[PDB]
Design a protein around this ligand. Structure first.
Ligand SMILES: C[C@@H]1COCCN1c1cc(C2([S@](C)(=N)=O)CC2)nc(-c2cccc3[nH]ncc23)n1
Length: 137
């Protein structure tokens, strides 16, 4: 089923987030959105904020249909640390470790993830095609 494949894909991504990325030592700065009351200028500097909680929310909404779209937001966490904290900040070194363990685990699950990504794409194109043939009935 398309629902089954979306569920499996999202569960794999979520397990990467909770079991690997959130387990990086000292990764607390990236676990939740920055609180504007604690860091008032953060959102003056960071136009496209991202964090691991928001990624999990997106996973739960089946936002990610590909490894690439997932990694777009994962890399946003690192890029926002580079911008706000600097490329040599310990915050950025931590974000880099989060990104690297993400890559390592996606590599581990690449065969299954690639198959799910293709089958989701195929099913989606078929459902789109069928919806359109039906609309003209
Ligand atoms: C801005 C820094 C560096 O970039 C990554 C983000 N990071 C953060 C992130 C967070 C959050 S929170 C608690 N939900 O706002 C998400 C955990 N809090 C802080 C913070 C809060 C209050 C006083 C502070 N002094 N120093 C840092 C700090 N900093």
């Amino acid at each position: 089923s398309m629902d089954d494949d979306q569920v499996a894909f999202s569960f794999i991504l979520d397990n990467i987030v909770t079991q690997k990325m959130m387990a990086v030592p000292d990764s607390w700065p990236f676990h939740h959105p920055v609180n504007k009351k604690f860091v008032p200028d953060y959102y003056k500097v960071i136009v496209n904020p991202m964090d691991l909680e928001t990624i999990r929310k997106n996973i739960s909404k089946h936002k990610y249909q590909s490894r690439e779209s997932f990694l777009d937001d994962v890399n946003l966490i690192l890029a926002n640390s580079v911008k706000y904290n600097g490329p040599e900040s310990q915050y950025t070194k931590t974000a880099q470790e989060i990104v690297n363990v993400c890559y390592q685990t996606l590599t581990e699950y690449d065969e299954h993830l690639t198959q799910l990504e293709k089958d989701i794409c195929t099913a989606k194109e078929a459902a789109l095609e069928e919806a359109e043939l039906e609309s003209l009935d």
